[PDB]
Subunit: 171 residues, 4 copies
């Protein structure tokens, strides 16, 4: 709770263009698989991104969601997937990776169910903060070490509905 402003870091039209590209790449990757495919979103930050991305993926797939939450602390499953991923191409859709702990542990958890394949697509990557090295196949934007909001991403529950990515500026 600090006096702040929001400033545009990635305008809406840039996000739209990037998601279109991610879309084409993802499609190219899975179009020939033949196995069932599911996009798994991590809630609730990733709802907007998932919504726009899955519309740009020209491959028949399912959409499902999982809610996880973690001074370390264990990553625990508040809400598991509705569907089985065994034998399917799974794509994990996340809003932001910075430390990597969360994606890292979630990938481990999902791998136990033996999907045909397992990959991650994150809209924003903040590598300056990476602690655990985790392989991310698809990245929309690598960004500077700034606290961003919008496009599903909140600051203290606020700003998820902004159609662009922006940064919180203090004082």
């Amino acid at each position: 709770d600090m006096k702040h402003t929001v400033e545009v870091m990635i305008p809406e039209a840039e996000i739209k263009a990037r998601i279109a590209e991610l879309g084409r790449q993802i499609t190219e990757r899975y179009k020939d698989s033949g196995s069932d495919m599911v996009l798994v979103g991590l809630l609730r930050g990733s709802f907007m991104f998932m919504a726009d991305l899955c519309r740009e993926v020209q491959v028949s797939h399912e959409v499902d969601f999982m809610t996880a939450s973690s001074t370390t602390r264990d990553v625990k499953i508040l809400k598991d997937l509705d569907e089985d991923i065994r034998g399917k191409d799974v794509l994990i859709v996340e809003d932001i990776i910075d430390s990597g702990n969360t994606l890292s542990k979630v990938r481990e958890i999902l791998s136990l169910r033996e999907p045909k394949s397992l990959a991650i697509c994150t809209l924003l990557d903040k590598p300056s903060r990476r602690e655990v090295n985790v392989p991310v196949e698809f990245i929309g934007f690598s960004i500077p070490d700034e606290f961003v909001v919008g496009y599903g991403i909140d600051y203290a529950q606020r700003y998820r509905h902004l159609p662009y990515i922006g940064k919180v500026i203090l004082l």
Copy 2:
């Protein structure tokens, strides 16, 4: 699950146009409230609708989600945030019989929000078993079986950008 096909019924552009109008209406009804606002989506069907709709709502608000299932309506995943004293708009993909939004409205009512309204993308008005008040409606449609824009048929077609009609063979 039978052999079939999918035809466009509501093009992407018409949805986008309608959602913009819903945006203005919702903004208008809540612009002056002052209290905190939250849109609550019912997963999974409402996620896409929610994504486009909240972007058209020009009032500061929070976004939350809930997963309910039957039989008696049971909560698989409750809201993350409190809604007490707040303007709450439930966002849903379809109302048909009315059973779901009926029981969800009851449950959330107990938390004593400032206000409680419903916004549904699709209304099938016929076959209404329990009559629930819905303030905002995207489209009223006949008793057609549709898929797309979040709505599945046996887990398929959720990612279509249009509403489509399943055609059996």
Copy 3:
């Protein structure tokens, strides 16, 4: 986290005797109903109490569990019942009621599903702290305004496994 001791308030043999009585009363109440009956425990404090009580209930019933958690704050369902209670005699089994808010809201939530009947059985009642008046049909012990542990009830996660009820004494 304070230096403390535990002292016996209700010895194990007293709890056993009381649960036996509660058992007989509950049995008397529902033996003629004919409708299905379910005992609903509130987790996780009530697991021990449920375990012992349901063994003293001579009526065919189901056992199910719910996990709820609440500066007020909303009572939210972390884990709902597995079974439907519509048309059944439902007995809510709780370890302690002191303020009453929790039982109060949980009863409201469960009533919406239209059980044949709805009642509460709590092992410990701390009425000096009652804020909301909530009707409790079955009570094991009304107790003084002391912080108790044991018999499923924790102090900072500690002491659930004690076979008796005791009080935490500071310094």
Copy 4:
């Protein structure tokens, strides 16, 4: 769900006797560890067993619960507390095929507890599809269909104080 009857197989007193021995064994194995201990029950079947067993364990520990379900093993309700760096004893009503405790052990393993052991009330050794290590066993039994002491038959008989055998007609 067919017409049937229920006969005692393991009387209440024999269970109580066995659980006391399990108590001494578990206490012995963990008395000197120093690290924090937690018993983790898998709901619903294990709640009664857990209630009697934890009372016989003479080492400070926490009690936690987990609800899993299938197919792929999915978590309906995760633990409330962290188990990292702790001695964790999974408490379960029955191991048969081994699939359940297998996947649950994997999942919990990822949280990197100090140690990870299993205590099961009943072992049906036959029909073991995946071989999982179980440190503590109440009773090994034939491939009989039993109910009671937490164990249901179509949601019935969980509250019996003995283990019983269902007899079909």
